[PDB]
Amino acid sequence: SLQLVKKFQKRLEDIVAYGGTRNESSVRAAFQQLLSDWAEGSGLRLITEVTQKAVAGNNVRPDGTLKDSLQQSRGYWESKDEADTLDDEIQKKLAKGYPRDNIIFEDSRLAVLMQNGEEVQRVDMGDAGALAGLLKLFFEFEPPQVLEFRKAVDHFKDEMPHLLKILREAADAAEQKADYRGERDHFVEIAKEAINPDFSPRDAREMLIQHILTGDLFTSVFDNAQYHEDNNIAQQLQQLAATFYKGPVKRDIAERTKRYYGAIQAAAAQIADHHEKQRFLKALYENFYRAYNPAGAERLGIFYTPGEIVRFMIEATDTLLEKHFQKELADKGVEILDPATGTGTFITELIDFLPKAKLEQKYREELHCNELALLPYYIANLNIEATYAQKMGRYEEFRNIVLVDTLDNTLFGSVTAENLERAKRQNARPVRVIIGNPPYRANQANENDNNKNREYKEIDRRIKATYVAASTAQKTKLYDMYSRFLRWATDRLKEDGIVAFVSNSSFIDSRTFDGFRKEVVKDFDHIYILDMKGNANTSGERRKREGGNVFNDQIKVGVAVYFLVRSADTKIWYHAVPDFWRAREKLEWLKTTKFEDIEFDHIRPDAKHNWLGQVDEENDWNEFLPVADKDTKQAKGLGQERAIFKLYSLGVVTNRDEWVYSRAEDELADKVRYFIGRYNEIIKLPLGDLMSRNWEGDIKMTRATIADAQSRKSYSLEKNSIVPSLYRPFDVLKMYFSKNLNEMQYQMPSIFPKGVGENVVIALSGSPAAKPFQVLATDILPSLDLLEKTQCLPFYRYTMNGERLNNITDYALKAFQTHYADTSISREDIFHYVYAVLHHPAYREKYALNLRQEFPRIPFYPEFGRWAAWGRELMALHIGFESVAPYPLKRTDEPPKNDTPEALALAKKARLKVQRDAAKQPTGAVELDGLTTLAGIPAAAWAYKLGNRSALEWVLERHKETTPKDATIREKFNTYRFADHKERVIDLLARVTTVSVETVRIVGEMPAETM
Amino acid sequence: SLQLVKKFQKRLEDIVAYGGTRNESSVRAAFQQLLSDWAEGSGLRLITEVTQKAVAGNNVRPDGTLKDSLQQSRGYWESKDEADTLDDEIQKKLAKGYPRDNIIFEDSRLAVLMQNGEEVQRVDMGDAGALAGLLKLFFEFEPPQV
Amino acid sequence: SLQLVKKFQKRLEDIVAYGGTRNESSVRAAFQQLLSDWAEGSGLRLITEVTQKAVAGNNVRPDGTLKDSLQQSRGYWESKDEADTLDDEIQKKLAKGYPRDNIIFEDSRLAVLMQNGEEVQRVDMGDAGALAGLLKLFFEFEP
DNA sequence: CAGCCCATGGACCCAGAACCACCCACCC
DNA sequence: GGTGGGTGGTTCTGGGTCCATGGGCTG
DNA sequence: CAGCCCATGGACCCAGAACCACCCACCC
DNA sequence: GGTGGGTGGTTCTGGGTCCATGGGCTG
Ligand SMILES: C[S@@+](CC[C@H](N)C(=O)[O-])C[C@H]1O[C@@H](n2cnc3c(N)ncnc32)[C@H](O)[C@@H]1O
Ligand SMILES: [Ca+2]
Ligand SMILES: [Ca+2]
Ligand SMILES: [Ca+2]
């Protein structure tokens, strides 16, 4: 520190005042003591006159050397006399071979650092600032050896499958034994009451692999072999491993795994700081699952939390412990649990935070840990004990970690009687801080994956009685593992506690989490949210604002560090991180910032318990509802009718778009044919195969199929079911509209009967509108992904054995007619007028948050006929995008590069792409393929935007050569070539170009007056 | 004095644990520190290696030279590597032309204080209480005028 | 025969262990040796990266160029990285004007032989007896 | 109660692009 | 002698989807 | 036989001794 | 500005003892 620099300057004058000596033998003693006191802080020590060898060999003698604990030099020092010039003698000493890696050439007047033969800092001495800078840089230089431990970490991160194959082969060939087969069926039984109630023989094989793999690395890379001989869990498992890992077999496997473990153990031996070796502990923790069992990596959500977030989350809880309660982390009674410990970074950084006096009492019985998987548990325990050795002194077994399912520990942890009673003492403790990082998993990829987060009966029961109870959300996503951990944390916490978790930022603002907030403010006295954004399941302008991910761009969900204190009305404090920041900036503001120095802005919850997105009320929002909650649910009793349209619908959902959304008529029939057949094969498959999904995933089986499959309800093709369907904006596709395949129809056969019917619908968007609110009047069967949250308001709702019953309810007609004193306004008139107002830009501009949360209340604007006629031109030119006469574009062809058929075929590939300028501006040119370029698109045609993508861009993206995400369709049914849809794409573009310009014209005639 | 001597010990093991050498040049950093720190509070200062003259010679060079605020030498220290037998390194030293007015002859685990013409008491450096008593006298020795 | 074929595999396995790199730059050395030896043993050679010129006038560079005594070309070898669908990189190479007479488009896992313009054979390069078959055919394809 | 509607937000990854090193043909 | 061009490797950086699955309700 | 006599080669240290490295006090 | 003494590491290298302990006499 600069304090030490000042002390050295006081010793420099003392030597030339008491001794009055100007000899090198006496003017250097000051710097000797200075480096010595700085070094003892870093972890090295300065040893004088170490005779070293030079490049020539001549024994040289740098006056000092920064020796390590493995006696390796991290640097050197050559003090010369105050008088002699340094730059000349630097170049004369260096000639004899003096070191150049990290030498501080000093002369009791000027200190220079030549690092890598390179002068970096020539700080003239006698400095109250940059001299401290110099010594910091010197004592923090990276040894050439640490950058190789980094290189070897990455290689192992990529030759892990090859190494794991060896261990996999071993465990299969051990199943030939009757000692393995007998003991691996008793492991399963003891582990069908402790960690996994569905412990499979293949889960026991996974544990065996992890135990052995980490055993070889713990004894070499980390030198701690005694860990496995002491850890209760290891012993219960060697009982199962030394059944096959013995004598010859043991030697064979070990010598076959050497061409992978070798290098890591030849660079991990030349570094001697555990904090650097922790980078491999993390790497192994994650990579193993991604190279072996990604199914586990999903539900467990194995991930590492960057140190910056952890350290912030520790200092912030310490600076809140005296604020609302009255204590300090290093007090007595601050029992800090941490469910979900993973690599242990939440208790290793706590050890480093705690002072080196009370640490003993805290390490012994106040720091607690909880884990479910084996690899994380082992890594965490070893890490904590090694951090204790680096901080306090003599290794002392951490005896507070456990292997229990936290959400189920409410005979848990019975794998070892030790961990059982360890989790019993944990349960009995009065815990006060609950810090940690929960899994944010919620739902599986596709239902052919077969991976649901274990239903925690006890824990989800209180969620149902608390978070879910208040939330009236039609869909319920409050059963997320993050919210389950929150429930467990609030119930462990007795009184005066600080739950600090980092999780998905959906809790702050989601229709689903509207009631979570309501209940959470009752169980707490102060809430301190810190939105770190970084959401990536969004597109367009939104993905820009969110920016980089505070989890090293490894996840796509939003992240928010929240601290809910309970001093036992609340005060919701909030600080959104500046938008458009990248990840490395976000994780720097989280190291260089103190919690008490951020400026939180009091949020006062609204009636709907919405924290963000607070609707403004000064606006004239309340007008004429298009559909109301009770217009769709009216019991067909004319009277409660309270809006314009009555029964509205939603975009068709299928769940098997790989076997339902195609271009050609028979192309779909073929994908569906194989299905209608393989479902019928899965049907003849046993009742057990139907009950526990023991069949094949060649075809997309969603819940409906899995169920009519259990009832053995064979299917059969009805060619009538296939119907033209507008998949995306201006993209007419085909679709098997049947009850067999499509998961939810949403009263679509009541709006568009039997796929083919004649009602004209207006597609709208939903709420909250993630993508900008959009409007598409369509006459073709729609899709849920056509517009953002597609919700279709129809015009002539049909009935069963019935007919076009006008939809605009009669109440709406009367109100409109009487208001404009017309008594002649028709249903079409209203329809068209509504479309014009919806399209009106200033309408959705004034009502921004009003529209993204409830149904767009259409205002009664001064003239009716004017807007009715506006929305008439709009309607027609958007219901007939394939008749609108084209706009004259220009095809400028060219020849292929060479004459090889290979080049010609590669020049027929859909390189469909917009041609943006050096300033991201479309030039009005679309490169169709490598032989044709269409140009002349007007710039006003790029303006019309249905979502986050212009109408023209939609057509290109919906005709690009994409590879199906299914394998059975990437091999037998991928037949779409840009060659098939060549001139049809050009034809579509020409007509859509005209449509785009026309829309802008009509929408421009509309003013800025907003009723 | 007692806590200070109990830290000279720590930084002795540290020279060998970090460096890995027992050559005199490197193991002398611990005793240097101890002496200088003790002298600071008392008022004096150990200025290391101040070439001191001799009765018979061109010049000699002690490795420690307590020099007071008025540049006057009142005590010295000559280190020793473990290899040499300290006693015979003493006669070798006090023959070339080394001072005897006040000098600490220390090896690494045993130390004598030849003070003003005669040895006082020989103490081992492993014992904190012993080295304390002796260094006190190296620092509480004052000339006759005082 | 099969001995030299097995030797190639051994060499490649040492490259991905003593260096750890599975990049072709280092892996090719193994196949370079195998092709050069079977050749000398059947009256030929494997001169490496000899720039050929295409009909369109592109100076192409195959990784190999089995040439014979009067300095004429008889075959051409081209090895792609073990980290790409081979049947995709074959097209890219041929679309620069790559020779189609007798070319071994080979990735570390599969070896495809083209002659005139048709895939004559594709073998798992791991099976010793199978490669031994394909390699012999390439060295015996006479104009 | 049991099928049948109605939600609603979801722990990354991989193609280009820039660019770099090395050597070869080809202007110089 | 440079230099642009073939071959190959190494970092960045930009940028975004259909569909699972519990509640609420007819019936 | 016990208790005197007669052999007969022995699994290394080390004290200088150069000799150099650094560097301060003295001749240049 | 050299330039040797003077302290310290460093690595060669030349050179050389008293005395155990079985067997054969041996009284
Ligand atoms: C994000 S990781 C832990 C994070 C940790 N701070 C780190 O940096 O590695 C989530 C971990 O929670 C553990 N875990 C413990 N109890 C769990 C439970 N009941 N449900 C899910 N995961 C649990 C899993 O084994 C998994 O390794
Ligand atoms: Ca020096
Ligand atoms: Ca000395
Ligand atoms: Ca190649």
GROMACS .gro file of N, CA, C and O (backbone and C1' of nucleotides) and ligand atoms in nm, chain A residues 285 300-305 340-343 345-346 370-373 376 404-407 437 439 456 481 485, chain D residues 11, ligand 1:
model
  142
  285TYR      N    1  -1.643  -2.915  -1.305
  285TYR     CA    2  -1.783  -2.914  -1.256
  285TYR      C    3  -1.881  -2.902  -1.374
  285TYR      O    4  -1.973  -2.985  -1.382
  300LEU      N    5  -3.078  -2.983  -1.254
  300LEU     CA    6  -2.988  -2.928  -1.149
  300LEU      C    7  -2.945  -2.787  -1.187
  300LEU      O    8  -2.909  -2.710  -1.096
  301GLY      N    9  -2.946  -2.755  -1.317
  301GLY     CA   10  -2.906  -2.621  -1.363
  301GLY      C   11  -2.762  -2.592  -1.328
  301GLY      O   12  -2.733  -2.477  -1.288
  302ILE      N   13  -2.674  -2.693  -1.340
  302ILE     CA   14  -2.531  -2.673  -1.301
  302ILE      C   15  -2.473  -2.554  -1.377
  302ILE      O   16  -2.482  -2.552  -1.502
  303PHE      N   17  -2.422  -2.454  -1.303
  303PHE     CA   18  -2.361  -2.333  -1.364
  303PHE      C   19  -2.272  -2.271  -1.256
  303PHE      O   20  -2.295  -2.300  -1.138
  304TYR      N   21  -2.174  -2.190  -1.296
  304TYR     CA   22  -2.089  -2.120  -1.197
  304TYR      C   23  -2.131  -1.972  -1.192
  304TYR      O   24  -2.164  -1.916  -1.298
  305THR      N   25  -2.131  -1.913  -1.073
  305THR     CA   26  -2.168  -1.770  -1.057
  305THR      C   27  -2.039  -1.688  -1.052
  305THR      O   28  -1.957  -1.713  -0.961
  340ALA      N   29  -2.792  -2.518  -0.248
  340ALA     CA   30  -2.736  -2.507  -0.384
  340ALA      C   31  -2.595  -2.453  -0.380
  340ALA      O   32  -2.574  -2.346  -0.436
  341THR      N   33  -2.500  -2.527  -0.325
  341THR     CA   34  -2.364  -2.472  -0.310
  341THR      C   35  -2.279  -2.493  -0.434
  341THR      O   36  -2.190  -2.412  -0.454
  342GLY      N   37  -2.303  -2.596  -0.513
  342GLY     CA   38  -2.226  -2.607  -0.637
  342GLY      C   39  -2.077  -2.601  -0.613
  342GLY      O   40  -2.030  -2.677  -0.533
  343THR      N   41  -2.005  -2.515  -0.681
  343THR     CA   42  -1.859  -2.520  -0.665
  343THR      C   43  -1.819  -2.466  -0.528
  343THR      O   44  -1.701  -2.473  -0.496
  345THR      N   45  -1.849  -2.145  -0.424
  345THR     CA   46  -1.794  -2.008  -0.430
  345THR      C   47  -1.867  -1.917  -0.333
  345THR      O   48  -1.825  -1.805  -0.319
  346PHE      N   49  -1.970  -1.965  -0.265
  346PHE     CA   50  -2.048  -1.874  -0.179
  346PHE      C   51  -1.997  -1.886  -0.037
  346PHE      O   52  -2.032  -1.802   0.042
  370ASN      N   53  -2.519  -2.711   0.138
  370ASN     CA   54  -2.617  -2.814   0.096
  370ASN      C   55  -2.595  -2.847  -0.052
  370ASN      O   56  -2.579  -2.752  -0.131
  371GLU      N   57  -2.597  -2.976  -0.088
  371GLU     CA   58  -2.570  -3.017  -0.228
  371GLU      C   59  -2.655  -3.140  -0.264
  371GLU      O   60  -2.697  -3.210  -0.171
  372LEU      N   61  -2.677  -3.166  -0.393
  372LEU     CA   62  -2.753  -3.286  -0.437
  372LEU      C   63  -2.663  -3.377  -0.520
  372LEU      O   64  -2.668  -3.500  -0.499
  373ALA      N   65  -2.583  -3.319  -0.610
  373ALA     CA   66  -2.499  -3.401  -0.700
  373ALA      C   67  -2.367  -3.438  -0.632
  373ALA      O   68  -2.333  -3.374  -0.531
  376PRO      N   69  -2.021  -3.169  -0.773
  376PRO     CA   70  -2.024  -3.042  -0.698
  376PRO      C   71  -1.993  -3.061  -0.549
  376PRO      O   72  -1.909  -2.988  -0.500
  404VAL      N   73  -2.814  -3.354   0.053
  404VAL     CA   74  -2.960  -3.369   0.069
  404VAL      C   75  -3.031  -3.285  -0.035
  404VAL      O   76  -2.969  -3.194  -0.086
  405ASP      N   77  -3.153  -3.321  -0.071
  405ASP     CA   78  -3.233  -3.239  -0.165
  405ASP      C   79  -3.293  -3.129  -0.080
  405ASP      O   80  -3.389  -3.158  -0.012
  406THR      N   81  -3.238  -3.009  -0.084
  406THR     CA   82  -3.282  -2.902   0.008
  406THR      C   83  -3.432  -2.892   0.009
  406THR      O   84  -3.488  -2.880   0.116
  407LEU      N   85  -3.494  -2.900  -0.107
  407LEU     CA   86  -3.639  -2.874  -0.109
  407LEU      C   87  -3.712  -2.990  -0.044
  407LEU      O   88  -3.828  -2.973  -0.008
  437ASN      N   89  -2.749  -1.927  -0.513
  437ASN     CA   90  -2.792  -1.914  -0.654
  437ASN      C   91  -2.877  -2.036  -0.691
  437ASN      O   92  -2.819  -2.144  -0.716
  439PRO      N   93  -3.147  -2.295  -0.914
  439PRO     CA   94  -3.162  -2.328  -1.057
  439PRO      C   95  -3.279  -2.250  -1.118
  439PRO      O   96  -3.376  -2.227  -1.049
  456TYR      N   97  -4.162  -3.125  -0.616
  456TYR     CA   98  -4.135  -3.127  -0.470
  456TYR      C   99  -4.269  -3.117  -0.397
  456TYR      O  100  -4.318  -3.004  -0.381
  481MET      N  101  -3.794  -2.363  -1.027
  481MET     CA  102  -3.701  -2.407  -0.920
  481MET      C  103  -3.652  -2.286  -0.839
  481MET      O  104  -3.631  -2.302  -0.717
  485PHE      N  105  -3.707  -2.258  -0.438
  485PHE     CA  106  -3.597  -2.231  -0.342
  485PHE      C  107  -3.633  -2.109  -0.258
  485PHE      O  108  -3.601  -2.109  -0.138
 1311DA       P  109  -3.558  -2.152  -1.874
 1311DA     O5'  110  -3.435  -2.134  -1.775
 1311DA     C5'  111  -3.313  -2.207  -1.793
 1311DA     C4'  112  -3.206  -2.115  -1.846
 1311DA     C3'  113  -3.101  -2.185  -1.930
 1311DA     O3'  114  -3.036  -2.087  -2.009
 1311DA     C1'  115  -3.004  -2.117  -1.728
 1411LIG     C1  116  -2.600  -2.287  -0.994
 1411LIG     S1  117  -2.544  -2.441  -0.925
 1411LIG     C2  118  -2.487  -2.383  -0.764
 1411LIG     C3  119  -2.427  -2.246  -0.790
 1411LIG     C4  120  -2.294  -2.221  -0.718
 1411LIG     N1  121  -2.296  -2.088  -0.650
 1411LIG     C5  122  -2.179  -2.224  -0.818
 1411LIG     O1  123  -2.121  -2.116  -0.841
 1411LIG     O2  124  -2.150  -2.334  -0.869
 1411LIG     C6  125  -2.696  -2.524  -0.875
 1411LIG     C7  126  -2.661  -2.642  -0.786
 1411LIG     O3  127  -2.766  -2.662  -0.689
 1411LIG     C8  128  -2.753  -2.795  -0.645
 1411LIG     N2  129  -2.871  -2.831  -0.567
 1411LIG     C9  130  -2.871  -2.859  -0.433
 1411LIG     N3  131  -2.990  -2.887  -0.386
 1411LIG    C10  132  -3.074  -2.877  -0.496
 1411LIG    C11  133  -3.213  -2.895  -0.511
 1411LIG     N4  134  -3.294  -2.927  -0.411
 1411LIG     N5  135  -3.265  -2.876  -0.634
 1411LIG    C12  136  -3.183  -2.843  -0.734
 1411LIG     N6  137  -3.051  -2.823  -0.732
 1411LIG    C13  138  -3.002  -2.842  -0.609
 1411LIG    C14  139  -2.728  -2.875  -0.772
 1411LIG     O4  140  -2.661  -2.996  -0.745
 1411LIG    C15  141  -2.644  -2.777  -0.856
 1411LIG     O5  142  -2.507  -2.815  -0.858
   0.00000   0.00000   0.00000
